[PDB]
């Protein structure tokens, strides 16, 4: 009774076949890069409008890699977008060394992981590899973990 692993470790893709959720009814304002956190700025007709994470926002999900929706290499303004709201996913990071297992991550500007000492939110899942003179980490996203401030 076990969960299978997934083969290619590139940024922006899913790392396991555990319970995951993909919110595919969204549109982008500005440009978004695969493997970055996004935030919900508004809702029109059951569609969520997302943008790259600013300072002071609450992350909602992580952009997901697809080879039909995004032929350019990144997500462009006015495009339908895939966002992962629950599951394990490879994220871009600016950190230098792996944090403690099952710690709480903190997101800098642009939707990159820079902290490992948060109070509550998403947690580190134990994966830490290297990409392009930069690193990739593995994050565990949960649905109601970050709550929008009143």
């Amino acid at each position: 009774y076990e969960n299978l692993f997934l083969r290619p470790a590139c940024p922006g893709n899913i790392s396991d076949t555990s319970t995951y959720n993909i919110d595919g009814a969204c549109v982008a304002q500005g440009d978004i890069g695969f493997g970055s956190a996004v935030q919900v700025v508004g809702i029109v007709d059951g569609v969520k409008v997302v943008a790259a994470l600013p300072d002071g926002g609450t992350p909602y999900g992580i952009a997901f890699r697809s080879q039909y929706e995004h032929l350019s290499g990144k997500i462009l303004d006015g495009e339908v977008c895939n966002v992962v709201s629950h599951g394990r996913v490879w994220t871009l990071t600016s950190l230098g060394e792996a944090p403690s297992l099952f710690s709480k991550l903190q997101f800098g500007s642009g939707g990159v992981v820079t902290g490992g000492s948060g109070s509550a939110g998403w947690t580190f899942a134990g994966g830490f590899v290297k990409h392009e003179d930069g690193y990739i980490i593995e994050v565990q996203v949960k649905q109601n973990a970050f709550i929008a401030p009143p």
Partner: protein
């Protein structure tokens, strides 16, 4: 590994071939019956029942799992566990695998010669229907190949699987050898690049990453029509190589061992003609023919004795097997010429009259249709 032979059978197509080429061709070869009033209605009823695919599957399970059973449900106004009164009638037949049959009641009376033989069979198909009971006369049980009685009795009087561990491991290591050969081809040539102080750089940093990217890029653009530049005092670039030879012969020898252990020969197991000879593969066909015929009389015939009396009202009959030789119109054209001249070149002087000469000529199944008559 893979102790449950069913997974092996449904995984590797080779074992599939070894297990299913013989019985299915055996049954599709056909047979003929004598002592009946006629045969057209025999064939009409036969393909009306059209149970030969079920027969094929029953034989295949018997050969693979070592055992199988078929139950023939007969149109009679009695409850099924009771024995069967004499008659010639049938409405359906259906096949159970080795796992679905158990012994329920046993007779040991010395008067009957059936002591020590099961009388009642407990059949448990499943499918949320209650397992039930069958009288011996209604069911027939088919086994595989013979095995020592000590093993037979611990296998509750059932045969053995044709895929023994020797054939299993012979199949297993051949694919391993093929993968190893692919690795041999992959590792034919290697390039080595040595740089003074290359170990100095820290791990997973931009310098090492750029060095690796540069190495990959220069690797991509090398070839016969392209050259590389290096630094004489610091770095060098060398190549090492090894040869490949004999690998096809190793694969051929392994496949030949497969053939020897299987017992069925090459132009049926590897499906490749030798090509060096014109008229020896035909003799290979007759060797296969004698093998399949010899295995035929031991298992296909008991099915015929079990089922045939239940369809024919006729009392005494004969079952004779059609000669398994791939025919050729031209060849049977001169065969028919030879038969027609032999049958009446000299009977014009004996008492051999029309009603027996016609029977003789149409007993050997010709292409000549003859209406019944004088």
């Amino acid at each position: 590994a893979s102790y449950h032979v069913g997974s092996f059978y449904n995984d590797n197509a080779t074992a599939k071939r070894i297990v299913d080429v013989i019985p299915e061709e055996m049954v599709t070869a056909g047979f003929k019956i004598s002592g009946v009033k006629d045969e057209k209605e025999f064939k009409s009823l036969w393909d009306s029942y059209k149970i030969d695919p079920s027969l094929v599957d029953a034989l295949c399970w018997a050969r693979l799992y070592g055992g199988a059973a078929i139950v023939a449900i007969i149109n009679d106004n009695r409850m099924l566990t009771s024995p069967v009164k004499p008659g010639a009638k049938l409405e359906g037949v259906r096949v159970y695998d080795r796992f679905a049959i158990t012994i329920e009641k046993r007779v040991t009376n010395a008067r009957s010669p059936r002591y020590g033989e099961p009388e009642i069979y407990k059949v448990s198909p499943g499918d949320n229907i209650q397992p039930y009971l069958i009288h011996h006369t209604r069911i027939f049980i088919a086994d595989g190949e013979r095995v020592t009685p000590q093993m037979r009795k611990q296998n509750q009087g059932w045969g053995a699987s044709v895929l023994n561990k020797s054939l299993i491991d012979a199949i297993c290591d051949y694919d391993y050898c093929e993968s190893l050969a692919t690795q041999i081809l992959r590792r034919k040539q290697q390039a080595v690049w040595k740089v003074k102080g290359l170990a100095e750089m820290c791990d997973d940093d931009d310098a090492q990453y750029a060095a690796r990217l540069r190495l990959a890029q220069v690797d991509d653009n090398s070839g016969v029509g392209r050259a590389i530049g290096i630094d004489a005092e610091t770095e060098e670039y060398d190549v090492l190589n090894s040869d490949i030879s004999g690998v096809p012969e190793f694969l051929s020898s392994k496949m030949d061992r497969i053939v020897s252990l299987s017992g069925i020969h090459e132009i049926i197991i590897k499906n490749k003609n030798v090509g060096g000879v014109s008229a020896s593969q035909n003799t290979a066909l007759e060797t296969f023919y004698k093998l399949v015929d010899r295995k035929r009389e031991e298992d296909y015939r008991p099915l015929l004795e079990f089922l045939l009396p239940f369809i024919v009202d006729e009392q005494e009959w004969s079952i004779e097997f059609e000669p398994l030789s791939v025919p050729s119109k031209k060849e049977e054209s001169e065969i028919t010429k030879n038969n027609v001249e032999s049958v009446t070149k000299a009977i014009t002087e004996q008492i051999i009259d029309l009603e027996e000469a016609r029977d003789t000529l149409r007993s050997i199944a010709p292409e000549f249709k003859l209406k019944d008559g004088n």
